[PDB]
Design a protein around this nucleic acid. Structure first.
Ligand SMILES: [Mg+2]
Ligand SMILES: [Mg+2]
Ligand SMILES: [Mg+2]
Ligand SMILES: [Mg+2]
Ligand SMILES: [Mg+2]
Ligand SMILES: [Mg+2]
Ligand SMILES: [Mg+2]
Ligand SMILES: [Mg+2]
Ligand SMILES: [Mg+2]
Ligand SMILES: [Mg+2]
Ligand SMILES: [Mg+2]
Ligand SMILES: [Mg+2]
Ligand SMILES: [Mg+2]
Ligand SMILES: [Mg+2]
Ligand SMILES: [Mg+2]
Ligand SMILES: [Mg+2]
Ligand SMILES: [Mg+2]
Ligand SMILES: [Mg+2]
Ligand SMILES: [Mg+2]
Ligand SMILES: [Mg+2]
Ligand SMILES: [Mg+2]
Ligand SMILES: [Mg+2]
Ligand SMILES: [Mg+2]
Ligand SMILES: [Mg+2]
Ligand SMILES: [Mg+2]
Ligand SMILES: [Mg+2]
Ligand SMILES: [Mg+2]
Ligand SMILES: [Mg+2]
Ligand SMILES: [Mg+2]
Ligand SMILES: [Mg+2]
Ligand SMILES: [Mg+2]
Ligand SMILES: [Mg+2]
Ligand SMILES: [Mg+2]
Ligand SMILES: [Mg+2]
Ligand SMILES: [Mg+2]
Ligand SMILES: [Mg+2]
Ligand SMILES: [Mg+2]
Ligand SMILES: [Mg+2]
Ligand SMILES: [Mg+2]
Ligand SMILES: [Mg+2]
Ligand SMILES: [Mg+2]
Ligand SMILES: [Mg+2]
Ligand SMILES: [Mg+2]
Ligand SMILES: [Mg+2]
Ligand SMILES: [Mg+2]
Lengths: 50, 79, 64
RNA sequence: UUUUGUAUAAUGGGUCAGCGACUUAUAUUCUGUAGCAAGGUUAACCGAAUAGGGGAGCCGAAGGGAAACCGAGUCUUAACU
RNA sequence: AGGACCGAACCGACUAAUGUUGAAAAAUUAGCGGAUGACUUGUGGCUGGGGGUGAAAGGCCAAUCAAACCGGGAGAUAGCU
RNA sequence: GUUUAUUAAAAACACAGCACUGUGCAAACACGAAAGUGGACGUAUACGGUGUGACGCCUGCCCGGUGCCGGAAGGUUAAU
RNA sequence: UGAACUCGCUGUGAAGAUGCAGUGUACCCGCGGCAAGACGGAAAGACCCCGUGAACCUUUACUAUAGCUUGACACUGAACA
RNA sequence: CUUUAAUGUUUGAUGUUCUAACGUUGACCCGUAAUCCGGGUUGCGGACAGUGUCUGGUGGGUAGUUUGACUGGGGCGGUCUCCUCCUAAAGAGUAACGGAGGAGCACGAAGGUUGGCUAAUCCUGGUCGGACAUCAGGAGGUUAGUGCAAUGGCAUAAGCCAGCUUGACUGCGAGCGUGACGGCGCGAGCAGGUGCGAAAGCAGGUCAUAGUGAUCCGGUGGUUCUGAAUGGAAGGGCCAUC
């Protein structure tokens, strides 16, 4: 269970965030995705993935 | 060594034929986990993510065998 | 003396128009990352109490 | 009496007479019956005291929502076929 | 002289039989141990219950002791008969 | 010598002797919310606790563990 | 001490029968003896298991606490290095 | 205007001296014809000792409690949740301390879509090279493969390779399956926005079935729901999440 839980934070001013999991030793690079933000109702980038 | 430890709740196999549920899409008319020998005949909507067949709107449920390999399909007669 | 209500159930159940009771679903407090959004969305609303549990609910809540 | 099951060699009783075990109070739900009918009913207390006064209150006639709030609609949702 | 020897009173209780709704809720008969000592006995006094006392056996503390007796919490509780 | 009054009198307890340990006196220790009392009208040749148990010959090795005794270094550490 | 007009054998039976089935034997009633049976008499088995029972005892089980012990403040003051 | 020095002042610590608190179960006198007690004189000790509050350590000396269930009697051993097969008697379901195996994960691509492709094994020929590496052809037609145990599936591929991508989206959801319940599961279709493709279309994670923990208590972010005289705030509620 070395895989750990991280949260993807919307780049917009909204505080909305998603949650997922990722391996730390294999891919330490930050994860960047494009997901729907229900507050602004648009697809935006997400960050903050250790 | 070691015994017992048998899985539980094997779900279900057959849920009906002809106008048994009929109304709406239903969620039966399939042997879950089967796929083989129970395919979507086009008349009924395709499988679910767990290989579950279901209806479109209404009608009788029928079973047929056709096509190469002699596979069995479930269709629904729209009414 | 008066019957004392179960305060644990008074804040768990609420009475509806036709005598039924509404309650909040379970499994929506923590460890939510591995739960499907469909499941959590279906759990978010409130449901009614089943036939078998109404006897216990009414016994617990005499003044509701 | 207890048991799947007892004439059982499973328990109890030597016999007679007397006594001996589902009650009372207050709350709440349902059934029957009586009064009244969108209304029903008073508690303490006063009283020439089972009358009469006393409507403080309580239940019902409107629900939805966590709540603000809205209201035969309300909640969810940016909004719902 | 001796926590010396044998042996009565005196203090014990090793064996056997009897008794076991007894003569007796531990005794009788025949044997047995100590018998100037750490001895035995009369009268009075002190130590009181999670406490006392104990050459120690969980022994004794009014025929009751791995926590005395009397009264109260008290109709303790009993998924058991 | 003592013991289970009332199924066990014994190889069990005690014993004289031996050893360790505490105690400088308002002693240690014990009873007691305290006062106070015993120890003791005693003073280390005394008193208390623990083990062994006349007498004879003896009582070997181990301080890693637990306990006890000692240690102006250093680390951690309460109240304030 | 349920009431008895209270035999043997073989089988049956809640599985070891005076009372059931078949069969054999047996005039009615005492007294003196023996103890094979009436699963004989007494003690709601002490062995075994169970109860989300009890009581004592042990410890590097848990949580507390008397006692002992460390420090700060108070009772508690003044000079010098 | 100082990274720097020193008379004096304040405030801590250590060590000596003092005496007036305090101790005296040292001596003497009085109450008093009294080894108690009190007062007085004196000697010794002395801000120590000792007591109160708070506080760390130790504390079976004492006290209250716990020390599971199944079980071919208990105990020892084993097991307790989830998944696959048989037992299971051709719908579902079905027990034993019955017979056999696995799980308490993994993946930012191993997901989505578009385009393309088809295995194991054997035989013949050929430098190292051979029983087996790579190459060409021929048999064979899934005996191959699947992220992981077993069953059921898969050529259309669910198996293999590449391009672009984040639908592993948000709010709902007619209808249904399975449970005593808590709950779990499948799901067309609607609204918003998005990816692949020329388009029809597909995509609400992975071929499916294991990879999991209720409630309470509390932590983090958002909210303009509440805010005990009023305005705020604290706290609480709601949404996401630990
Ligand atoms: Mg929450
Ligand atoms: Mg029985
Ligand atoms: Mg019978
Ligand atoms: Mg019998
Ligand atoms: Mg009987
Ligand atoms: Mg009985
Ligand atoms: Mg009887
Ligand atoms: Mg209302
Ligand atoms: Mg003599
Ligand atoms: Mg003699
Ligand atoms: Mg004797
Ligand atoms: Mg004699
Ligand atoms: Mg002699
Ligand atoms: Mg003993
Ligand atoms: Mg006695
Ligand atoms: Mg007691
Ligand atoms: Mg009481
Ligand atoms: Mg009683
Ligand atoms: Mg029971
Ligand atoms: Mg002797
Ligand atoms: Mg004696
Ligand atoms: Mg003294
Ligand atoms: Mg000895
Ligand atoms: Mg010896
Ligand atoms: Mg007979
Ligand atoms: Mg017989
Ligand atoms: Mg006779
Ligand atoms: Mg006789
Ligand atoms: Mg009989
Ligand atoms: Mg008997
Ligand atoms: Mg019994
Ligand atoms: Mg204890
Ligand atoms: Mg208790
Ligand atoms: Mg206990
Ligand atoms: Mg058990
Ligand atoms: Mg067994
Ligand atoms: Mg079946
Ligand atoms: Mg069948
Ligand atoms: Mg059944
Ligand atoms: Mg895959
Ligand atoms: Mg393709
Ligand atoms: Mg794929
Ligand atoms: Mg898979
Ligand atoms: Mg305010
Ligand atoms: Mg908040």
């Amino acid at each position: 269970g070395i895989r750990e839980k991280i949260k993807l934070v919307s780049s917009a001013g909204t505080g909305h965030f998603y949650t997922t999991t990722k391996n730390k030793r294999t891919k330490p690079e930050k994860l960047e995705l494009k997901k729907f933000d229900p507050v602004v109702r648009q697809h935006v980038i997400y960050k903050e993935a250790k | 060594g070691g015994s017992t430890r048998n899985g539980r709740d094997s779900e279900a196999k057959r849920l009906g034929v002809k106008r048994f549920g009929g109304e709406s899409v239903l969620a039966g008319s399939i042997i879950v986990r089967q796929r083989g020998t129970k395919f979507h005949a086009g008349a009924n909507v395709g499988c679910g993510r767990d290989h579950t067949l279901f209806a479109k709107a209404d009608g009788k449920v029928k079973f047929e065998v056709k096509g190469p390999k002699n596979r069995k399909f479930i269709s629904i007669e729209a009414e | 003396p008066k019957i004392k209500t179960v305060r644990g159930a008074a804040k768990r159940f609420k009475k509806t128009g036709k005598g039924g009771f509404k309650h909040k679903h379970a499994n929506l407090r923590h460890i939510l990352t591995k739960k499907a959004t469909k499941r959590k969305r279906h759990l978010r609303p409130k449901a009614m109490v089943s036939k078998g549990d109404l006897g216990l609910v009414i016994a617990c809540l005499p003044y509701a």
